[PDB]
Design a protein around this ligand. Structure first.
Ligand code: IK2
Ligand code: IK2
Ligand code: IK2
Ligand code: IK2
Lengths: 425, 425, 425, 425
């Protein structure tokens, strides 16, 4: 019943490989509030890593879950079907962008969704290679670790991950990688390592998550769509983190002016219950023969009803508009703090997928990982839970529930401001 | 709201790759009973594919879940920890066989569990290759599809799965593969394709599941343990399906007389909620550096409290003894039926992990997949839900909850008896 | 100028990885005679590892080489062509078995020939995987080491060789692998790891060379041809060692009753000059696009005229018949020796591809590698150069030139007899 | 006889995959002249693709070959050794740059040399990955095709080549890739796809050959050497084409100011006879265990004496100085032609490794492959044999023997000058 006592028990019972960002054991939570085992209250700006866009235990979501719990929790869909799985698939087919008919597969984790999107693209194109981008993050299974553009620590010490995954550059002007450089890096793969006829898919996060909250511009995404179209390559949009409304539209691709062939989703789709999925061009989804897709827990009944309710909540509570309003208030406030702290070299974000990036004395070539970690620690001491990201660990991101109250927005920005003021001296 | 209308909607919204064993939409369930959307009642001998050893919605499990729903459903353990994850790890470290210190990681699906056990073995041994057995089944991610000893349909049409996974023969006297043949096939790998110094682990199901309910003998497992010891190879016991009490002991390895270095578990561990994990020798588990293990939903709070309750139920309701008793009653009944049906060439199984195998005119080299499929269909028509398995699709398995009523044991065996009598008419 | 001083210099200038079977420096040679730097004369029963079926420096071969040396030694065929390359390709299209149009590519080494046959099959079938057999030997490049069914020492310590090469069992009744077992091991790969639709070729040595001089029966080869036909898979006959007349026919496949799609050849094709090549069904050979095949030294002019002359010598000197006569004389003498030494557990071979296998106390389960090495060393001391082979290093092979004189046959057999008698004193 | 008649026979007996740059069949050649079967005389500026630095059939080389031909042509060194192989290794150990003990392995082709250098690096570092550069060319075996930075046509239509080969950018200011971009691309691989501890070697051509005659600067090579040193990575200099004197020093690395760990050589090392090898840091070479290195024809006796004689000729005839003088005369002559032809956008090269690059309207972004091909064809009609190179096929390279006389230098430049004038007419 103390965080420290539980941390000691953790070190003796759980491998050190599972890191602990905050050495705190949560006991209960509601919307943006979390209480630890000692009764201390925190304001949650991490949202369980973008999983709680509708807040901890949204009452509508919980009541849907409680009703399903009276019916059944598991049959394994492939054995005996159930309606919540079917209804969610129909809804995702309508909401994921694309003017063609789509089909949806439900699985359980984001890594599984990416795994399956790739398998489907391979079966549909009869090709085996894939292309992913620098700083990308797609999961912790062997193949998704290969797709993830970061070896340490995700796959550190394990030897080489699966081959035949080629690396393109993610466009990022802030750090000198132009859209031209990014597209040229894909043609480079075609010419040097894997011809287009051997590439089943190009996988991309419309807004990189663990990679630093860097967004693709519609122009880049349009050139990418054209390049895939030219070569029969499937464009896979990994919206596990950017999806379920974080960017102000349900899916970030809606803001890109083009539709991907396959979209993966998870995290906030079910507001705190284990569910993930893949929605894409119906004929591409159907390339795999019966028995080729599935999973024991896939599309768990309770999680399906939670997701159907999350989508209803977005509509009833106009959370997309709130995401945009929230993002503006956050950026306005961070820009204000940036006026007094040159270390804040960039304030950015689509909708509520907001981040700031820190540099030693403002030099874009010197990521300040130290100040970043210090701000995360100081915030925690003030009762605010934050996460950093980026290949250089100098990006601070905000993933607070879209259901946050106005007073809490001011409260969080004030704490952050205090952390930077106090970090000096 | 008829099964037919829902199947039509399925064809429009969900990929055909997700097979539908039974064209039925379940509406609600309780213990061993499932009711479809039309109100028809069925006896569930599939148990959601060995996930419901405590039955659908065990009341104790559901009450614990309902209580946790008033606290929190998700924080992402590696961000903010919580006690149910910790407690379950402590208990698994004690319950998994091996008289030495252990640690446990929780993830969400069985495939993720196997993925992590291999990543851990690789980090621990500083080697990259793995060996798996003929007919094995380990999951649907790219790497676990490579480990899985069956291409069609699991990875059919997708091109070749990850390399550096080698194939040994699973011992099966019924089909002419002796234990010597099995051990020799491992040495063959060492000599022809991958030396011991490049093999991080040998992955094996103590009792193959999708592969036909073929169990390893203690003598064979002991020879394997010695072979791994000699070469510094990690022995990974995949107990995703054999575990959580199906064979009469919590883990089948308990009946082998030797302990693995790592064990995967999932399915019945949480009685119908998404949870999986890996428990192993502490020093092996600790080989991965911080940040190297994780997952967004991993050890979901609700699923953890469900697992803790499943473990108490096993103890309180004497479910291990019941598994053994149930298995004896099932085999006795199946043997009686076999006296009248030569096609049943084998009746086998540890605990309640029971199966019968069909051969044309009891000819061991002639797998009778048509009869097997006919029995499954005749059983559904009589209200009994069964699954077949085996590389040749001729094994009928029984995975009915261990909480089955005495009358239902009689009912299922009687229905199976009628199916064989009516198929022979 | 002494063998010992040259061996000391060798230890300082050349990697220990290049083994040295005999610590002798050859100075000159003629037909089956070799003289070292110390003037000692030896009888060559190794033939430079089956490279000298026409003997060291056959006078007709040397005369052709001398005539070509006056013209040119290299232009790179793909840059400026030359007639000897063209003429040899025309002849091999006719000589290689297969009653259909063929085309031929010339390269330089046997490993390059195998590499090319695989590249060609992959382009022809649009598939990436290959199957090779236990104990096979196909060369020392990364891919041919993967095809090679022996890790130690060929690829020992280098980490895992290229993936997507699967292992079947070579038929060998002497060691309990029946033809049914061999064919079943192929279906096992199709079911467990790589479907036929992903297998471009099955690569096989009609008579395994480094593997122990084990020969496929015509019945087995016919079943393999039927299996390949059914699945659109290319049958590649690696005749680098079995070819150029060693078995009594120019190519061993001629005795199998069926034709492969692709044949590799090297070693004795040019009687001691660097040349290798691939001959196959015309439509298969033409699947690779222009520029996809080549090599700097490929089809070297001097080696081409040497090969053209070697083929003429085979016709003029009736070497195919001599091979069969030599083989019988050798086997007869070896059988005579086996009557006094039970350790000789088998005497076998097609044509002049002769071997005996040694067992500790006639026990086929106890390969006698120590005695084998002892016989090689004793023979060397008596002036006879021999080589062993076999995955267990207990096979003595004879690859003496087909041009050997009758008295030398007796001389060699007598030496081997003395070696076994004295090893046993 | 006729070139066209021979081309027709070629189309019927040889696969189209073997391209034919010049549809001409050579009959005889001497120094820089070649005569076809129609008796027409050509000036050879291709040198059999840089194999004839000492010219066709240098008399001293031929005399050495003739002397060896009276002794023996093949024993397979690893069976029975011979002095020429030993003597050549001793000399290469001292002449390849590196102020430390080296050992040398001889094989037969350049692709085999690169294959072995990587196998040796892998065994020495106990790592399996490699890094190669954009536009690189290393051979036609599966693994060297993966190293080769060009898919079409070298590995076109065959599916994906071996994985675990990562791609860095070769520095080339002319085309916008700075040295900083190049080094940053190596760090990118380390961070995104393969940690340094999994990279056995970085393979680089000091001057890219098929990639366009682009040379590394000493500054870049020094940074690359420092990066390899920091991470324990072996630096492999592929000097198969740049070596044996082409650049003015025996090996190009000598001009870089640093030594590689391993160097591959072939082509001009033996003046037109099949030989290749790897010379490197002794303890790295010795990391492979006995039996782990070899090859049937490896270090062929005749090619060894040819190479020993080529090295003496370089000394006796001052060929390195001549290569520098030749290079200057060529560049001066080409610059004069460039004053009248804007299409020639760059004239470059170290020593006699000279090239010019053609651009449409002198625009660096508009490679002129059509004009380049027209020049090669016109030059041939005028009796001058040329080759092009470069990933965009717009680089004309000159590889004429270093033994060329002044009159022929003038004559070849005049022919080239005419081709450009007549191309614009
Ligand atoms: C774009 C994207 N795809 C895929 C995934 C993978 O989803 P899941 O964690 O549900 O497997 C994630 C998960 N972020 O998780 C972080 C961590 O574990 O350090 C993600 O952001
Ligand atoms: C031993 C074993 N390991 C691992 C797994 C994989 O576990 P999970 O389904 O939770 O990923 C399974 C799952 N069986 O799944 C059947 C199917 O989808 O056809 C399994 O039996
Ligand atoms: C059937 C076969 N294929 C292919 C090859 C490879 O041919 P090459 O050595 O010309 O590359 C060989 C070579 N045997 O060489 C033995 C050794 O080096 O220990 C062979 O026997
Ligand atoms: C740097 C380098 N390494 C390695 C090699 C390979 O050497 P080899 O051709 O002797 O195998 C080459 C050969 N270039 O040959 C051209 C072609 O066949 O199109 C090369 O240039």
């Amino acid at each position: 019943n103390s965080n420290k006592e539980l941390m000691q028990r953790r070190s003796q019972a759980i491998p050190r490989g599972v890191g602990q960002i905050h050495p705190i054991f949560a006991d209960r939570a509601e919307n943006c509030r979390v209480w630890d085992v000692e009764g201390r209250e925190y304001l949650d700006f991490a949202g369980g890593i973008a999983v709680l866009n509708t807040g901890h235990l949204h009452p509508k979501v919980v009541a849907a879950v409680e009703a399903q719990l009276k019916k059944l929790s598991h049959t394994c869909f492939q054995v005996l079907a159930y309606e919540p799985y079917l209804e969610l698939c129909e809804i995702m087919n309508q909401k994921v962008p694309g003017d063609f008919a789509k089909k949806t597969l439900l699985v359980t984790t984001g890594s599984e969704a990416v795994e399956n999107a790739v398998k489907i693209a391979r079966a549909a194109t009869k090709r085996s290679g894939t292309i992913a981008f620098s700083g990308a993050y797609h999961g912790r299974t062997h193949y998704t670790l290969a797709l993830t553009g970061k070896v340490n620590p995700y796959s550190a010490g394990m030897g080489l991950m699966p081959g035949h995954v080629y690396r393109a550059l993610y466009p990022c002007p802030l750090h000198g990688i132009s859209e031209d450089d990014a597209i040229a890096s894909i043609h480079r793969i075609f010419k040097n390592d894997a011809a287009p006829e051997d590439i089943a898919a190009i996988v991309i996060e419309p807004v990189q998550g663990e990679g630093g909250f860097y967004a693709s511009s519609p122009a880049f995404m349009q050139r990418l769509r054209a390049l895939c179209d030219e070569h029969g390559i499937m464009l896979i949009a990994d919206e596990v983190q950017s999806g379920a409304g974080r960017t102000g539209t349900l899916f970030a691709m809606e803001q890109m002016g083009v539709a991907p062939d396959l979209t993966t989703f998870a995290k906030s789709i079910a507001g705190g219950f284990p569910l993930a999925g893949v929605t894409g061009r119906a004929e591409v989804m159907d390339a795999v023969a019966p028995g080729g897709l599935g999973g024991t827990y896939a599309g768990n009944p309770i999680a399906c009803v939670a997701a159907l309710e999350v989508l209803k909540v977005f509509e009833q509570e106009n959370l997309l508009q709130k995401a945009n309003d929230l993002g503006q208030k956050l950026k306005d406030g961070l820009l204000a703090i940036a006026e007094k702290h040159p270390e804040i070299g960039d304030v950015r974000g689509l909708g509520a997928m907001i981040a700031i990036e820190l540099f030693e004395d403002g030099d874009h070539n010197k990521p300040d990982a130290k100040l970043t970690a210090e701000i995360v620690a100081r915030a925690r001491d003030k009762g605010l839970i934050l996460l950093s990201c980026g290949p250089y660990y100098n990006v601070l991101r905000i993933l607070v529930p879209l259901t946050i109250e106005d007073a809490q927005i001011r409260q969080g920005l004030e704490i952050i401001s205090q952390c930077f003021d106090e970090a000096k001296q």
